[PDB]
């Protein structure tokens, strides 16, 4: 439980970055690779020993002005090539193949900026895209068809911000500016019929446009947790985690401690809070936390450049942990944290187009 600054870098365009994503699809032993997106550029690096990090590749968009926002690593079932997709303010989604160093797929169906991208833990052709259009879409990146559109008569009213798959990949949570957090399901018969259909469609075959699925109702929701924005949520086994600009992270479960997660009636009107976590100076929004693939530690960026670290272990959240690893160079802000498949290294992005690196000493 000790990371040390073994390297720190800085870009040249000096425009703030947002994204950090190790490729968690490393065949055991392969080098550590990770990427980061900035104003209108992407960056490819590789972790080396002795705090060495090596520039690998970088692309850029010129034909317009955009501030890229998110990324996600996946692969191709067909030939196992690594796959990275990104999206920015323009609201378009691109798909790049580093093996050929080209973009092979682009998607345009939103109406505003995008805010996050994630994949189904099991299926690799299912991309979830969260936007400001109040609508959370979901694509089959392989047959080039939309599937669902969550939002409508009972959706979010203002600029959905963040979402998160359950650990197994059948349940989602969503959070946006309207203090509102709503539950969606995927396991429903209708849903999976739809998905299977999606995996089968030839445009040349029919004169019909594929028929998506519109969903106008959350499985459950409330706004009683915070009295401010909510901009990042994390499934916890069957528990919940969320942050606000109120300088505290909270864990809770819906209903009562006795209430199972999978028996919850849609008209449920109660929630159970368990504990709180604390920190200092997160007085702005759009700042995220991450966790190890082994769900044992917690990382979080900070406004003034600090850090705050806990353990996801039996440490009682009343007095679970407190670990602040700090350096004296930048205190502008830190947007996002990221671990490898193991807990070896931890990266974070400062607000000034500067990178950091922290090598763990257990």
């Amino acid at each position: 439980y000790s990371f040390k600054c073994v390297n720190s870098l800085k870009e040249d365009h000096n425009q703030p970055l947002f994204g950090v994503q190790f490729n968690w699809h490393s065949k055991e032993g392969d080098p550590l690779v990770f990427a980061t997106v900035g104003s209108n550029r992407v960056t490819l690096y590789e972790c080396h020993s002795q705090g060495e990090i090596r520039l690998l590749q970088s692309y850029v968009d010129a034909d317009a002005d955009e501030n890229f926002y998110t990324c996600a690593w996946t692969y191709d079932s067909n030939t196992s090539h690594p796959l990275l997709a990104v999206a920015g303010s323009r609201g378009i989604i691109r798909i790049i193949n580093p093996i050929t160093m080209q973009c092979i797929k682009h998607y345009v169906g939103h109406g505003n900026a995008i805010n996050e991208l994630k994949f189904h833990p099991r299926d690799p052709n299912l991309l979830l895209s969260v936007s400001k259009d109040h609508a959370l879409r979901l694509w089959n990146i392989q047959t080039d068809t939309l599937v669902a559109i969550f939002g409508g008569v009972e959706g979010h009213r203002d600029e959905v911000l963040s979402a998160d798959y359950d650990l197994l990949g059948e349940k989602i949570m969503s959070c946006g500016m309207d203090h509102s957090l709503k539950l969606w399901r995927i396991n429903s018969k209708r849903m999976m019929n739809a998905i299977k259909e999606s995996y089968d469609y030839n445009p040349n075959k029919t004169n019909r446009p594929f028929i998506s699925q519109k969903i106008h109702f959350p499985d459950f929701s409330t706004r009683d947790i915070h009295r401010n924005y909510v901009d990042c949520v994390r499934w916890l086994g069957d528990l919940i985690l969320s942050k606000s600009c109120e300088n505290a992270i909270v864990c809770w479960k819906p209903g009562k401690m006795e209430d199972d997660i999978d028996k919850i009636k849609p008209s449920e009107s109660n929630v159970t809070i368990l504990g709180r976590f604390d920190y200092s100076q997160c007085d702005i929004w759009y700042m995220r936390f991450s966790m190890d693939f082994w769900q044992k530690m917690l990382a979080l960026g900070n406004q003034v450049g600090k850090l705050y670290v806990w353990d996801l272990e039996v440490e009682d959240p009343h007095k679970a942990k407190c670990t602040t690893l700090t350096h004296h160079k930048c205190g502008a802000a830190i947007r996002q944290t990221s671990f490898s498949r193991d807990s070896s290294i931890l990266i974070a992005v400062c607000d000034d187009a500067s990178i950091w690196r922290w090598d763990r000493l257990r």
Partner: protein
């Protein structure tokens, strides 16, 4: 008024029992974590 006073007063024992139960819940949930993660 003194509503919050008696609130925290009862919340003492409430949160005691709650801590017991949520420790049990931590155990259970961490277990499922182990399973699915593996």
């Amino acid at each position: 008024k003194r509503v919050k006073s008696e609130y925290m007063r009862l919340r003492q024992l409430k949160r005691f029992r709650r801590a017991d139960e949520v420790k049990s819940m931590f155990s259970s949930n961490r277990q499922k974590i182990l399973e699915r993660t593996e």
